[PDB]
Design an enzyme around this catalytic site. Structure first.
Site, mmCIF file in Angstrom:
data_model
loop_
_atom_site.group_PDB
_atom_site.id
_atom_site.type_symbol
_atom_site.label_atom_id
_atom_site.label_comp_id
_atom_site.label_asym_id
_atom_site.label_seq_id
_atom_site.Cartn_x
_atom_site.Cartn_y
_atom_site.Cartn_z
ATOM 1 N N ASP B 165 0.820 -1.189 0.000
ATOM 2 C CA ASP B 165 0.000 0.000 0.000
ATOM 3 C C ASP B 165 0.862 1.250 0.000
ATOM 4 O O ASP B 165 0.908 2.032 -0.964
ATOM 5 C CB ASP B 165 -0.730 -0.003 1.330
ATOM 6 C CG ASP B 165 -2.105 0.552 1.235
ATOM 7 O OD1 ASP B 165 -2.530 0.929 0.117
ATOM 8 O OD2 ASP B 165 -2.762 0.590 2.293
ATOM 9 N N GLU B 415 0.962 -10.275 5.751
ATOM 10 C CA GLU B 415 -0.008 -10.528 4.684
ATOM 11 C C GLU B 415 0.512 -11.213 3.407
ATOM 12 O O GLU B 415 0.167 -10.806 2.303
ATOM 13 C CB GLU B 415 -0.744 -9.227 4.335
ATOM 14 C CG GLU B 415 -1.479 -8.637 5.530
ATOM 15 C CD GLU B 415 -2.528 -7.630 5.138
ATOM 16 O OE1 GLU B 415 -2.280 -6.848 4.196
ATOM 17 O OE2 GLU B 415 -3.601 -7.619 5.776
ATOM 18 N N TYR B 470 -10.974 -6.765 8.237
ATOM 19 C CA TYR B 470 -11.727 -5.652 7.658
ATOM 20 C C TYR B 470 -12.920 -6.546 7.383
ATOM 21 O O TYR B 470 -12.886 -7.355 6.451
ATOM 22 C CB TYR B 470 -11.019 -5.151 6.402
ATOM 23 C CG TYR B 470 -9.714 -4.521 6.748
ATOM 24 C CD1 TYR B 470 -9.670 -3.237 7.264
ATOM 25 C CD2 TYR B 470 -8.526 -5.224 6.613
ATOM 26 C CE1 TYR B 470 -8.468 -2.646 7.603
ATOM 27 C CE2 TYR B 470 -7.329 -4.658 6.965
ATOM 28 C CZ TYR B 470 -7.303 -3.362 7.451
ATOM 29 O OH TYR B 470 -6.099 -2.796 7.790
ATOM 30 N N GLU B 506 -4.281 -5.367 12.688
ATOM 31 C CA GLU B 506 -4.902 -4.325 11.858
ATOM 32 C C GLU B 506 -6.433 -4.393 11.893
ATOM 33 O O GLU B 506 -7.025 -5.383 11.432
ATOM 34 C CB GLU B 506 -4.441 -4.417 10.397
ATOM 35 C CG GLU B 506 -2.984 -4.050 10.093
ATOM 36 C CD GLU B 506 -2.697 -4.057 8.585
ATOM 37 O OE1 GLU B 506 -3.650 -3.924 7.774
ATOM 38 O OE2 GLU B 506 -1.517 -4.204 8.209
#
Ligand SMILES: COc1cccc(NC(=S)N(CCO)Cc2cc3cc(C)c(C)cc3[nH]c2=O)c1
Ligand SMILES: COc1cccc(NC(=S)N(CCO)Cc2cc3cc(C)c(C)cc3[nH]c2=O)c1
Lengths: 603, 603
Positions: B165, B415, B470, B506
């Site tokens: 990102d 990740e 998320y 996260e």
């Protein structure tokens, strides 16, 4: 004269609010001399009614225009309207209107927030088209109800200045309509509800009438005829009833019949059985200790001006309902009646106010050229006419709203300077005359912070204490710590001085949505929250404080200046009604309390 | 090789961080062939060090540049530096550096987040000026530690793409320095604190040394010599001590002496008596049940890039301290050591992480041209070298941070996709090798939500469960109601699968400061608050959840894309550190708890 709110039974309306009219400026002021209203405005364009003319066109030159503008439109009178009474009505025309049906001058009005109407039967023919031309003036001067001053420049043009915050929107802000009546017709009505310790009670009718006999009948919520009266002049019916209350707001319907041997006229006037008056330091509705919440509001929104709008209306009330407002004030002018009908219907408490704003010359903030009259009450500045023009403004609002149960109080003005001399001589008569117009409700005059408890020469003349205070903001800027002292000190100092009940009709700080600060300082969201926290902490330590209304429900537009960042940013909500982090703080306090109930000097 | 943090006693430094160096791009890659480093860069301009080169100039062409850039500067070697050891050190050089002292190539480094140094005595003369030229590369490819792909276009130029990102800042991000040593010199040290039910305990020294005998002495906070050891290779001192704790963080100082008959070398290595390891579903520091709070962070700020900065450092910690963070993770790369020294000093718990990010190809969001290698572990894409390059990256971080008490855990990567085939074959060796490098701390690999409890082939190989989730945001977008189920369902499903302790490394939602909504929906401030509320409600209903770290402390910069509105907007704070309304919600939860203590499955 006599104002009656149109509703639809032996009467029916074409609303002419059908929006698009022809529109033009008259930059030459040659319009009346050239008799524009005899044919189609030329050089026109479409404009919508109702709404302000200023912002519909995204044009600064039109937005800041001062003088006369012209509205024109045509409309077929309904065939069924026979030999009937034909009546043209405007809910408002901002500042001044003159009206031509084809060539016939039918109407004239000064005042921008109240209705005016005329019988037009003789220059109209049912089944045919008729021209409607309106001349609209937005100029303010000293005998006008907000006062102001038009400076004509040397170069040909006008330029308006005035003394209030909010921007000078003008135009046809509310519904127009053509409406129909029988030749027998109710044309006036008045009603008073007395209450007695909450068991039983009585209401008085009085009613002026086009020629005819009145049968008066009061109905249930469910249309069961529980009150009856005879007489075209007066009654009292003592029934044991269901009251108009703040959580819930019940209403009765009093039909009104005027009779001839040819005709019949039928009128339903919604009625709320409620008593209002003051007792010591308490405010009493149906003999109860109220506590006010909610805001000062404005009629302001993107694009339309102060123009009326149903969606806007429905949304804002949703927002007020959610956040715990039980009440509000019609900040600095009479609002469109629909707001009041809604308030009654929903039981919302309303301090109703006149357009008498900006009597004050100290307010303020001038780096610029001084003049500006030296004496506030003078033949130069606030004068005999001005008290008379002002008187007339108070008639009308009361003429319009006496029958609205939601109105628990009248407001004579907002923030006049009472340090100059004539200030008690100007205000005493109107205070007297107010109660001679309606003795059923208490009356106030809203107070600017620099006429403070030691200097203000006018407050005894009124029933309730209405204060606008900014203690960390205009003075003690940014200092909650010393701001709290001054405020309490000054609230206690009022309590002893007058031993009246006190409401703060304005408390708030400019806040930019999205400005966030770890230092919690001016213009930040956090600051607004801390400052409202504090004002609150302090009304919880005062017995005489029985009302709280936030400066602004939402950001509105103002005159251009150094102290206004694209308008007044003191809204709890932005102008597009997005909530600042303070909507959620007021949320807790306002729904956490018991209804109409101050805390335990704590919570 | 061996890394020791410079401090100042028989050694002293000229920091060369003195900022302004000469700078240039080498768009022709003719720089090495033309031997630029022999004279002054031409066509240069001033640049500051430390900071990223990308944003110092407000120029997109420089910001998105890929390839080699040149830094150059001159510097007098201090006269007092005799015949001494002269040593040039860089705390980081982002991605790759090569260094020329006048004409002598002294150094080479791949890796962008860890130090490298060289003995420069033979090409330098104390009391004279010497040229320093650095060649800096920012290109990523498959054997690089973040991996990536440089597409050269047909037209001559490079263009970098990669898989994480955060934006590809590059340059000299940290302090450079020239430093001095005696010819006898400590050059390596290692220390282990064992703890015993909290009464008493022992620490081991091991120490490689430039030729000389070591006297090892441990000092009090108040410099009273309470531990002594002899031996240049090993000891253990069992004293009954004062521990390194999270609220308070006490530290000892172990001086290290290396002796010759000509010389002496003195070194203070701060030491925190603390034990770390896992027991069942519990995380244990000094044999206690911890609970983690705080964030994933980045090294990112306006203007400087990932460049180090004292003020920034002091302010952010003030902010973390205030809001209740006890811990954080070095999101997706080794941070500047100063952060860790501060963490020790202040007792702040740190999950330390390598630059191994973006091993994943499913992530993602592509409307664009596919390739992109087909098999993630292949000689094409993640290959033998890549496991070796990766291995080396893990050495260094551990080489650097083994002695930092604040580090309670290592993080191998963040990740990676573990659905393709080689994914367990790649990860098993490094997991083993990690503990063969430091067995004093637990090790993790951070988990992407699509390698979910039924599909992820790698988690048993590690000690603690680190999840990035998320649930209302990337999936179930906007739906707290179903998002809560999936999340809990999936947390319980992990608890039984592995019976390891779980930390969410996260959890967060993009939020625009100043966006406010009565409908409390995506991108609004209110939504962030509701979504964090909910994730929270759910960790309070799970026993295995022992850690919580918010996605982003503050908004950072990203690669340009459709999913990034001027960067990642998932900060609790904006990039200029202004707090979003969620800073105050986390505030309550994080200071309301007992320190290091989960709630009563409620509060
Ligand atoms: C002319 O139309 C405008 C244009 C721009 C701003 C305003 N401001 C207005 S209406 N207010 C009243 C707030 O309720 C702010 C205000 C407060 C104030 C307080 C003190 C104590 C003193 C000494 C002087 C003050 N002057 C002010 O202006 C009016
Ligand atoms: C290449 O560099 C960039 C550029 C722009 C955005 C990103 N996004 C990143 S790193 N994330 C990871 C959040 O921790 C968002 C993300 C989540 C995601 C979730 C699922 C379940 C699936 C199927 C596909 C997904 N794709 C994504 O992109 C990466």
């Amino acid at each position: 004269s006599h104002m009656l709110r149109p509703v639809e039974t032996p009467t029916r309306e074409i609303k002419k609010l059908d929006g698009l009219w022809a529109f033009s400026l008259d930059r030459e002021n040659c319009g009346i001399d050239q008799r524009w209203w005899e044919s189609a405005l030329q050089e026109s364009r479409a404009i919508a009614v109702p709404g302000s003319f200023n912002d519909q066109f995204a044009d600064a030159d039109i937005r800041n225009y001062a003088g006369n503008v012209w509205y024109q439109r045509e409309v077929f009178i309904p065939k069924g309207w026979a030999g009937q009474r034909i009546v043209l009505r405007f809910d408002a025309v901002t500042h001044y209107g003159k009206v031509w049906v084809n060539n016939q001058e039918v109407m004239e009005h000064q005042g921008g927030y109240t209705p005016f109407e005329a019988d037009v039967t003789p220059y109209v023919i049912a089944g045919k088209s008729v021209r409607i031309t309106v001349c609209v003036n937005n100029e303010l001067n000293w005998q006008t109800i907000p006062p102001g001053m038009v400076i004509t420049d040397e170069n040909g043009k006008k330029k308006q200045s005035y003394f209030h915050d909010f921007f000078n929107y003008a135009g046809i802000h509310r519904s127009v309509m053509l409406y129909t009546t029988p030749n027998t017709w109710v044309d006036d009505i008045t009603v008073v509800t007395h209450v007695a310790q909450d068991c039983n009670h009585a209401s008085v009718d009085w009613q002026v009438v086009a020629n005819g006999d009145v049968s008066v009948e009061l109905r249930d919520a469910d249309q069961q005829v529980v009150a009856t009266g005879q007489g075209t002049s007066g009654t009292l019916q003592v029934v044991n009833p269901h009251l108009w209350q703040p959580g819930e707001g019940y209403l009765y319907e009093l039909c009104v019949t005027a009779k001839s041997q040819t005709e019949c006229d039928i009128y339903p006037l919604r009625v709320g059985i409620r008593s209002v008056a003051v007792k010591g330091e308490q405010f009493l509705i149906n003999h109860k200790p109220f506590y006010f919440t909610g805001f000062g509001r404005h009629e302001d929104a993107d694009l339309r001006g102060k123009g009326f709008d149903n969606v806007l209306m429905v949304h804002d009330h949703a927002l007020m309902d959610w956040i715990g407002a039980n009440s509000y004030r019609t900040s600095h002018y009479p609002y469109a009646e629909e707001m009041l009908d809604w308030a009654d219907e929903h039981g919302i408490v309303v301090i109703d106010e006149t357009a008498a704003v900006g009597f004050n010359l100290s307010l303020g903030i001038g780096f610029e050229a001084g003049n500006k009259p030296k004496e506030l009450y003078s033949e130069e500045a606030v004068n005999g006419e001005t008290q008379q023009a002002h008187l007339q403004a108070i008639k009308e609002l009361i003429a319009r709203d006496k029958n609205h149960p939601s109105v628990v109080m009248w407001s004579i003005a907002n923030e006049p300077d009472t340090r100059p001399q004539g200030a008690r001589e100007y205000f005493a008569p109107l205070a007297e005359a107010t109660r001679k117009l309606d003795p059923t409700r208490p009356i106030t005059c809203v107070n600017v912070m620099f006429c403070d408890a030691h200097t203000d020469t006018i407050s005894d003349l009124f029933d309730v204490l209405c204060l606008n205070r900014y203690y960390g903001w205009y003075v003690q800027s940014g200092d909650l710590e010393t701001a709290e002292k001054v405020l309490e000190k000054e609230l206690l100092a009022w309590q002893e001085k007058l031993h009246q009940p006190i409401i703060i009709t304005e408390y708030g700080v400019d806040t930019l949505a999205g400005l966030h600060s770890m230092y919690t300082d001016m213009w930040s969201e956090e600051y607004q929250c801390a400052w409202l926290d504090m004002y609150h902490r302090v009304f919880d330590r005062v017995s005489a404080v029985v009302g709280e209304q936030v400066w602004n429900f939402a950001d509105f537009a103002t005159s251009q200046g150094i102290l206004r960042v694209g308008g007044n940013k003191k809204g709890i909500f932005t102008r597009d009604r997005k909530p600042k982090s303070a909507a959620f703080l007021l949320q807790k306090r306002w729904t956490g309390m018991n209804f109409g109930e101050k805390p335990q000097q704590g919570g």
